[PDB]
Amino acid sequence: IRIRLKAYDHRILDQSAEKIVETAKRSGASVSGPIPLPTEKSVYTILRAVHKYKDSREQFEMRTHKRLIDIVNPTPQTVDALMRLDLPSGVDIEI
């Protein structure tokens, strides 16, 4: 079973990565390291002024990034335990 997670904040996604690795390792779930997936980018350009001065512009970056983990063995009781485990509100888990 593969679990993805994609969000903006790579700090709290990193501590979420070792926290899920720690839970899966203490459950003994044939753990695999979290693979860094490439980010996705969207750069928007806004008129700096309100009414005039078209050469005055500003750029706003949006960057969001994803990581993947894999569990080889079934281990359904620990899988249901990590389903019922609570998650922070930024980790954005996808099954």
Partner: protein
């Protein structure tokens, strides 16, 4: 007169091609972004306030 055309914006139009996009947090057409429904002015003001958590200053 702006909120007459705001009433056009929330009301469904006669034919479906007559429908157009307005950002509806602030009051204008003309450079609304589709995926936020905010135009440049109210977008950049509320982004400097700090909402839309994907957005920050851009440099590379």
């Amino acid at each position: 007169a702006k909120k007459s055309m705001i009433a056009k914006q929330q009301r469904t139009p006669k034919f479906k091609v007559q429908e157009y996009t307005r950002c509806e947090r602030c009051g204008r057409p003309h450079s609304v972004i589709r995926k936020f429904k905010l135009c440049r002015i109210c977008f950049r003001e509320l982004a400097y306030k700090g909402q839309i958590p994907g957005v920050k200053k851009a440099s590379w």
